[PDB]
Design a protein around this ligand. Structure first.
Ligand SMILES: Cc1cc(CO)c2cccc(CC(=O)N3CC[C@@H](N)C3)c2n1
Lengths: 39, 156
């Protein structure tokens, strides 16, 4: 049996840690909702 | 139960200790998460019970107590914040410029940020603090690193 606990407000936080890249990826989505790399 | 807007942890006791299986968003009295987190099972909020209302395994989305409410979209240009909520750790904004999932049915936002699977359901925000989608359905790339779709549902 599953339960929820509050973990914060939803707010844009100015000067948050800035990171991660921006790849353009060719993908397929199957009937099971799993993404895959179309190569 | 607790129906304050904001982000919440999704926990189970069915395994050793209390385990965080995912994250979700409460807005306008509706709780929003990813299908792979709850499997469409009911949820507890104190004494309150949350029953599933809508879901789709292919979108990997599910709403509790009402229809999907989150309709804001990545604009295709601006940076975004992943409001990440990892197991055992406090809520942490992470700013990024999304990449792109190219598919036969269209192009989708994607964020290249790697976090435990228990983080599945954490929201992604625009500069106005609106939820443009949820984190935790994506792919492992050549490097072995994880990339997640910005998964958004349709509001009626
Ligand atoms: C293997 C892996 C690794 C990482 C990070 O390294 C993940 C981060 C967030 C979320 C998921 C879960 C996920 O993407 N799906 C489950 C359901 C299916 N449709 C996709 C992660 N799965």
């Amino acid at each position: 049996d599953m339960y929820i606990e509050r973990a914060g407000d939803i707010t844009w936080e100015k000067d948050a840690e800035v990171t991660g890249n921006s790849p353009r990826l060719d993908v397929a989505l199957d009937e099971s909702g799993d993404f895959s790399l179309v190569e | 139960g607790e129906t304050t807007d904001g982000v919440y942890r999704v926990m189970t006791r069915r395994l050793l200790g209390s385990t965080q299986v995912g994250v979700g968003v409460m807005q306008e009295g509706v709780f929003h998460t990813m299908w792979h987190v709850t499997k469409g099972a009911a949820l507890r909020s104190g004494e309150g019970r949350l029953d599933p209302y809508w879901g789709d395994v292919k979108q990997d989305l599910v709403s509790y107590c009402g229809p999907w409410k989150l309709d804001a979209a990545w604009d295709g240009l601006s940076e975004v914040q992943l409001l990440a909520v990892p197991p055992g750790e406090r809520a942490k904004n992470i700013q990024t410029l999304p990449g792109i999932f190219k598919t036969k049915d269209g192009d989708i936002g994607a964020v290249a940020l790697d976090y435990p699977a228990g983080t599945s359901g954490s929201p992604i925000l625009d500069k106005c603090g609106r939820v443009i989608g949820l984190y935790g359905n994506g792919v492992v790339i050549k490097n072995g690193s994880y990339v997640s779709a910005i998964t958004q549902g349709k509001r009626e």
